[PDB]
Design a protein around this ligand. Structure first.
Ligand SMILES: [Zn+2]
Ligand SMILES: [Zn+2]
Ligand SMILES: [Zn+2]
Ligand SMILES: [Zn+2]
Ligand SMILES: [Zn+2]
Ligand SMILES: [Zn+2]
Ligand SMILES: [Zn+2]
Length: 304
């Protein structure tokens, strides 16, 4: 009767914004109700696979255990460097729009939408202009072999640290830098202790929303259409929020601190960085093999 929807984050976060806008559209255009579940509220991917949940929002990067190839988004420069062309990419990419749903299908999930949450931004105690600037810098990222490899290849020393300890580790010098979307940078106030921002353009934290396949396929052709329409709605709304949360975050960071610097890379500096990417692709294929090869190939085709 009621539809169960779980995501990875807390209220107000991007995935929750997408979720609520999805819930909104369904309830505004039907009698169905979407029961949302934020983090911890269920004790989740396996649940959706088993039909216990109907909808789930989980980032392909943290789905390595069920779908190794889903981690592909952690390869630096996998996708275009500018916000405009990445959006073009999510729209036209045969890899995103045709291959990926196949991968989730093999695990009993109807893939509804993949979307960028925002551009990765590096903060450090110095401005970063070349790979060499990463040398001897203990960088904290989200935990994944591909994220550590990106920075191992950049010259840096990957340094694990629970999220809630990241601020204090930047202050003490336990770490010298980290990467996060500008809005987590602003909101966490990381710029207060790590004032130099660099837009490297190498990563876009990509997430994904899907349904139980048996559930989705058991839906009337009208309900299937409703879900698709609701996902499209959640997508457009979410994209605009992201663009707008970005600039608002960049602005209020500058409103808060006079020590914050912003470094952006020209076409040629970025190129120096892309030369390091193959080391990460290899690590990706080492982890995923022939399926990874299949996926990675489409992604390279699509970027051309
Ligand atoms: Zn998020
Ligand atoms: Zn009713
Ligand atoms: Zn076009
Ligand atoms: Zn497969
Ligand atoms: Zn219905
Ligand atoms: Zn908004
Ligand atoms: Zn190897």
């Amino acid at each position: 009767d009621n539809w169960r929807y779980a995501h990875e984050e807390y209220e107000g976060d991007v995935q929750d914004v997408f979720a609520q806008a999805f819930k909104g559209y369904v309830e505004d255009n039907s009698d169905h109700t979407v029961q949302v579940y934020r983090f911890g509220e269920l004790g989740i991917m396996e649940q959706t696979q088993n039909g216990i949940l109907q909808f789930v929002n989980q980032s392909p990067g943290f789905t390595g255990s069920l779908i190794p190839s889903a981690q592909i988004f952690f390869i630096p420069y996998l996708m275009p460097t500018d916000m405009d062309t990445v959006l073009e990419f999510f729209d036209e990419s045969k890899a995103i729009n045709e291959m990926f749903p196949k991968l989730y299908a093999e695990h009993g999930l109807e893939l509804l939408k993949m979307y960028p949450e925002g551009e990765m931004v590096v903060t450090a105690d110095e401005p970063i202009t070349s790979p060499e600037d990463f040398d001897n810098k203990k960088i904290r990222t989200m935990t994944n072999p591909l994220l550590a490899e990106t920075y191992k290849a950049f010259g840096a020393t990957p340094t694990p640290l629970p999220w809630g300890e990241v601020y204090g580790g930047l202050q003490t010098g336990i770490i010298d830098g980290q990467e996060n979307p500008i809005f987590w940078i602003e909101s966490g106030g990381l710029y207060e202790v790590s004032p130099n921002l660099t837009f490297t353009s190498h990563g876009w934290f990509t997430t994904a929303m899907m349904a139980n396949q048996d559930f989705y396929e058991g839906l009337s052709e009208e309900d299937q259409q409703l879900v698709q329409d609701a996902a499209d709605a959640a997508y457009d709304h979410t994209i605009e929020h992201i663009k707008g949360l970005s600039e608002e975050s960049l602005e209020k960071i500058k409103a808060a601190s006079d020590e914050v610097t912003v470094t952006r890379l020209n076409d040629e500096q970025i190129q120096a960085f892309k030369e390091r990417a193959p080391q990460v692709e290899e690590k990706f294929i080492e982890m995923t093999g022939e399926q990874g090869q299949e996926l990675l190939d489409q992604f390279k085709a699509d970027l051309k």
